[PDB]
Design a protein around this nucleic acid. Structure first.
Ligand SMILES: [Zn+2]
Lengths: 266, 82
DNA sequence: CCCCCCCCCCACCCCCCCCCCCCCCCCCCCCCC
DNA sequence: GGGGGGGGGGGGGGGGGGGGGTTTTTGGGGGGGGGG
């Protein structure tokens, strides 16, 4: 169901959402067990955190000590779970055409932390939750409408025999070369060159490296653009770009706000 | 007293005691008997010193946190020294 | 190829809290049955 | 010999007082692009 379709009947149900990850926090430590130590007698006791509240012992547990207000919290001996907050934007497939996309913050825990990264389109299954937020930290006073978030419980994105058999072939060079772009009429030495570029040479320690570099020139209204598109589709981790400007993607590494951005070459 | 030159003052104390133990059970005057007893009081005292107790005043009620620590040792002492 | 331009980025009431005071409750001691 | 009553200490509650609660212009440097 749509992120835009959620309503207060959902406030404790297990829901399903689809959308785009904008960013995530670093891992946030979330206390699961407080660890208390007695100032006078150095006795220690573990207290589970209940509904986010520290159930502080008012007096020391040991009846032979039983001093009031003497227990103190030892922060770095408490036990912490992992929490992370991720901001999920409404996918443009679902938006009405005349307004901004919505977004929902989602909380994700333990080994589900870093299930996704910025730019990932995902599904999540999670309980829709809501909580109040304060008017000011020095007061208990709460605003009369709650923050909403989804508290996730599942996330999801969006052979050798044949290899050696084909490797026995005699026509393999021509077979593979024509296969990179069989929709394109014969330019076969270009196709062979680009296949050899896909394979590449080798590296060495000492630098000399396995890169192979190719250029196509000649008339503009011809198959070279389609050829670049096909090798882009074939290669595992390459990119497509053009020699100047930036449609939020540019060639060179570049300093901007302060952050270094890596360009298309990098 | 324990640390200085491995506590050679303790050897000074036993020498002050040996300098009456040399003269006989018959020979030792009341002053000599006192000197030997004084050396024993020195050894007893040096054993006996132990950290004091944090003696709180109870006129005024306890705050929302109790006493911060009972430790009474001065900053140049550690409990291993004692 | 050099210089100049021009473009970009950057700087008074209400709640929480703390202190003080008073009363009540619980324990211990002493007397009475 | 045990139970009641009286007296003293210690704790808790209530009240009172107090303090806290962003775009727009101007100037400068540096980088990039265009014209002679
Ligand atoms: Zn204690």
């Amino acid at each position: 169901k749509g992120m835009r379709e959620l309503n207060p009947n959902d406030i404790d149900k297990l829901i399903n959402l689809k959308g785009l990850v904008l960013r995530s926090t670093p891992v946030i430590p979330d206390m699961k067990v407080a660890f208390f130590k007695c100032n006078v007698c150095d006795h220690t006791m573990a207290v589970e955190i209940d509904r986010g509240v520290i159930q502080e012992p008012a007096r020391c547990e040991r009846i032979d000590c039983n001093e009031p207000n003497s227990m103190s919290l030892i922060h770095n001996r408490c036990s912490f779970a992992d929490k992370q907050v991720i901001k999920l934007q409404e996918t443009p497939d679902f938006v009405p055409d005349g307004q901004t996309p919505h977004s929902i913050s989602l909380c994700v825990y333990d080994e589900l932390v870093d299930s996704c990264r910025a730019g990932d389109r995902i599904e999540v299954t999670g309980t829709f939750r809501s909580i109040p937020i304060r008017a000011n930290s020095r007061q208990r006073v709460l605003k009369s409408l709650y923050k909403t978030y989804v508290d996730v419980v599942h996330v999801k994105k969006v052979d050798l025999a044949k290899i050696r058999e084909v490797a026995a072939r005699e026509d393999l060079y021509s077979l593979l070369a024509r296969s990179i772009a069989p929709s394109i009429y014969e330019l076969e030495d270009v196709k062979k060159g680009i296949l050899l570029q896909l394979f590449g040479g080798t590296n060495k320690t000492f630098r000399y490296r396995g890169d192979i570099n190719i250029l196509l020139c000649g008339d503009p209204s011809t198959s070279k653009s389609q050829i670049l598109q096909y090798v882009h589709k074939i290669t595992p981790r390459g990119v497509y770009t053009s020699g100047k400007g930036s449609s939020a993607v540019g060639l060179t590494a570049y300093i901007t706000r302060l952050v270094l951005e890596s360009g298309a070459l990098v | 007293i324990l640390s200085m030159e491995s506590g050679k003052v303790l050897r000074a104390a036993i020498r002050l005691a040996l300098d009456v133990i040399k003269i006989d059970r018959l020979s030792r005057t009341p002053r000599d008997n006192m000197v030997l007893k004084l050396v024993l009081n020195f050894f007893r005292n040096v054993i006996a010193i132990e950290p004091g107790e944090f003696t709180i005043n109870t006129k005024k009620s306890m705050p929302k946190k109790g006493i911060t620590s009972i430790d009474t040792l001065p900053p140049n002492v550690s409990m291993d020294d004692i």
